[PDB]
Amino acid sequence: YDIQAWKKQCEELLNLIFQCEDSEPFRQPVDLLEYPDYRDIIDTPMDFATVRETLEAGNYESPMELCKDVRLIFSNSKAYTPSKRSRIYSMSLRLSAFFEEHISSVLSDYKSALRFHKR
C-alpha cells in the first residue's frame, strides 16, 4: 500500500525500455529536419526522454499520467506511419506490448494503495 512506489517502478521500466532496441526511434523527439511534415499530422509530440524528464522533475502525480504520455508515443507512431508493414510500426507494436505487460501491476498497485489510503 505504498502510494509513492510507482515512481521508482516507472524509472526501472523506463531503464528497461531504453535498453530495448525497439525503443530507438522513440528515445528522443522526432527530428523535424528528417520528417518535415511531422507537425502537420501530429499535434502533440512525445518521446521516452521527455517522459523520463517529466518523471524526474516531479511533474507526474500518478503512473496513469505517465501511461497516457507513453501511449501517446505509440498513437503518434500509428498516425504518422500507418503502413502496418513499416519498420517503426512493427517496433511500436512490440514495444507497446512490452510496456503494457509491465505497467499493468504498477497501475494496479498504485490504485490499490490509494484506495487503501482513502478507506
Ligand SMILES: CC(=O)NCc1ccc(S(N)(=O)=O)cc1
Ligand atoms: C517516430 C516516428 O513516428 N516517425 C519517424 C520515423 C522513423 C522510422 C520510420 S520507418 N517506418 O521507416 O521505420 C518512419 C518514420
